[PDB]
Design a protein around this ligand. Structure first.
Ligand code: DKA
Ligand code: DKA
Ligand code: DKA
Ligand code: DKA
Ligand code: DKA
Lengths: 224, 224, 224, 224, 224
């Protein structure tokens, strides 16, 4: 039985279980969605599925060592963040006709936020400059959602899709903002940084995928 | 081969097997249900699936240590109790048109019953005050089912759904009442408390999900 | 590589493999059956699935210890025998309209045959009285199938269902009779008792489920 | 990393991987086949699935010991050979109306070829008489395919099914002939016998199932 | 937590995760494709599924030993390269009517490129002659795609299929060219050779399968 002194150990176990439940939920709930939205729910399951597969290894590292598994942490982000950006393309493709140029601009900004974030936690370029650079890439992320191809594409979509797109954008706004909070807490320690990161994937990976499922089911029921 | 002296060890093994069978049953029996009820049977499978995944770890703790895995016990409840409350929303959504405000009132009451229950078993706020507080949150749970949005929503539903809603409410009445019985037995010991909790999840997690499956299949066959 | 001196070790391995193949067969062959019979093939897969999950543990006990895993044996029966009795209800429900009162009478008789059977193998109430009591509960089992609600329900069913019902009844007659044969052999030893029990689940769990699949496929093809 | 000196170790690993891929292929490719042929592709997956599950244990025995896992080898054949004979019945049932008396004659001949084959490799009845007896049962196998109920049933089938039936018969002719070649090589040693047996299951279990899939897909596309 | 000094260890972990995600994606995304293209997405899942199953063993070898798992590397190629060549046949079969003689010419050339490639890494026929011979078989591979049955078959296909066929041919051109680059780097060392091979399967096994999925989904949506 798990300890009750270290909240981080509880979070590693709690989150890991939630990502396993979410992965099964997303892959199974593709029956309720139309063939256009089936790809959107698959990518959500992959994000939670990869994150769960990465959290199992990270949970062992915490018990065996007690230090933050930074290398395992950022490798998972390097694989799941592009798939989350793909969700913006998929919903605008399963509802409207979008070429997808906004995908490239968001993907480049996301990679910059992750590449510099890993370097700061590894001692490269100290930590304060990394926090500023990671923030600026996050600032570029929010700007392209206010004005871009997606904003033009979201205008012609159904009101249900528009509400989802705004909610997903908010998640980029508030949810992705909590990562710099954990970065600030853990370097400006390790126990709180891992706790915040654990809770972050609860929102940015599970709540993000639940918004996709809700809009897909509403649209699919309309068609039947 | 399992011992025959400790009934708790038998129950840990017997329950764990039943939750694995129930998990496969719920995820597979989504073929017999309409697309509206497919989400209801998925959540039932998640509850049994998470509980099974938690009972495997708890079974090891009992053999390795011999003490009650309280931390593993309440973490599972913290994850499965909200999903069981979601079943009340889902059945009223797959049968009627419900906004779902009763979900919030039940969820808040359920969390209070679990947060204080864990503290009592950990020595926080003794045990007698925790039993009273946990009972009162359980008393609030039954009151909102007698009068609330669900009661208004259940009135307009089909007689098959109404029978299920009443049966689910009963399970809240009798089934959830057995947890304070185990709490009273184990602190007012460990062998009986774990035995009762094991048997409790047999009713509140498996019988609860079988009521959902029965009503979903009856409704789906009517539509075809 | 497995030994060639102890036929029991071969049977534990040979049966365990057959139950894994049967479990996959039953859960996969639900595509060929109508939505009414899909529940019948699920329960067959659960019986073989639980039995396989129990035979894996029993196989280890035999190699590690060399004694009969009685406690693991009867726990599996306590979980799978009710599901086999449920098959009588399901086929009469997927073919006719049956209330299901015969289910209670068979279930009570089955539990008596298992409760006293475990006690005899554990030294409770010796072994000779347990064999007589277990036989009488088995004698009550066959009487209710000759005359009962199922016999009334089987009359109105299709000739394909009637042939299956008679075949399933026979399995209760001959197949369930082999368990007292192993009980008599092992106490009136261990090597032969485990060998018979291993072969018994080959008929009463796999051949029983193949009869269900055959009748379900014949009926489903008629509807299309 | 695997050794490059012992070709048998490579074959055990190479075959085991092919049977896992074939098992997933057969169970997944049931979407492309009509409900009549879905049972035929299931049995092919069971044969490869059981063989894969048996090859994993045999691969360990080879590394741990270095001797031929004869007992594990023949137990797999005792379970998969009847299922391969069932393929002749299934294809003639999913294409024509066949009672299936040829199944009994082939099954009896197959069991004789396996029972005596195991005895020869265990020292019972030497090895030369076992090779002759095993050959004669194989000679009876080919005779009943030239003239029997299947030959009468294959006449009325579609030309696509007839080509498959002839190809399957050939596999009995050439493919099953390679087992006595390995038996002759290994006793008239162990390294070559295991290598031949490994390659034999590549043809008689995978190529056999690919013929079933090819004919099922051609027939299903005709119906749509 | 993984080391940050050896990029090869990161690549082994990063690739292995991508192949697991790709395998689930390909087998799940068969819902969005027509029954003609379902076989094409299955083979893509098998390639990534076998490669993932092989990368798990190779990752252990790298940590345990630190040397290149050449034998495990080429066995995976011996099993996955023919399946990738089968993709050219499948897409031309699910879109047009092709006999498939170009499959034999490409398969023979592919095997020559792999047989000689393994020998060079094992010291057989040195390394420089192996690089030249492996290049020539790769040169024969590109020539038959410019002129062959596939080029004749691709002419009559839809413009969507033609774009996919050209993209797949390019992957043969650029993607398969990176293997000799790693061969040249690692012998004309081990750290860079494994890194290149890891990245190679990211393109030639995942990007190759994503081209198949994209064209299958576009064609299936047209039919509905
Ligand atoms: C200032 C530090 C910024 C860190 C950003 C971390 C991004 C994580 C993205 C996500 O998990 O979906
Ligand atoms: C007075 C103690 C109350 C304890 C309540 C425990 C709640 C468990 C809920 C459930 O398992 O679904
Ligand atoms: C006289 C002893 C009777 C033993 C009965 C054992 C029942 C097993 C039931 C079954 O396996 O489905
Ligand atoms: C003369 C020896 C004959 C050996 C026959 C072995 C049969 C194997 C059948 C098969 O693997 O499908
Ligand atoms: C000159 C050396 C050529 C090496 C070719 C290796 C082929 C790998 C094929 C592939 O991975 O799909």
């Amino acid at each position: 039985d798990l300890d009750a002194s270290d909240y981080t150990g509880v979070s590693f176990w709690l989150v890991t279980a939630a990502l396993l439940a979410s992965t099964v939920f997303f892959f199974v709930e593709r029956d309720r969605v139309s063939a256009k939205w089936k790809t959107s729910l698959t990518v959500s399951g992959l994000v939670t599925g990869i994150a769960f597969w990465h959290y199992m290894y990270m949970r062992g590292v915490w018990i065996e060592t007690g230090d933050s598994p930074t290398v395992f942490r950022y490798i998972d982000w390097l694989l799941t963040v592009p798939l989350l950006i793909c969700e913006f393309y998929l919903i605008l493709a399963a509802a409207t006709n979008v070429a997808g140029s906004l995908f490239k601009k968001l993907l480049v900004g996301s990679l910059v936020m992750l590449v510099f974030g890993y370097m700061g936690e590894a001692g490269i370029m100290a930590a304060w400059p990394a926090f500023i650079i990671g923030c600026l890439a996050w600032v570029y992320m929010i700007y392209e959602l206010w004005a871009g191809e997606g904003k033009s594409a979201c205008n012609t979509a159904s009101p249900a899709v528009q509400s989802a797109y705004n909610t997903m954008m908010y998640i980029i706004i508030f949810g992705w903002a909590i990562y710099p909070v954990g970065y600030f807490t853990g370097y400006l320690s390790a126990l709180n940084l891992n706790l915040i990161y654990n809770l972050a994937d609860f929102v940015n990976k599970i709540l993000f995928g639940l918004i996709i499922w809700n809009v897909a089911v509403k649209e699919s029921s309309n068609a039947g």
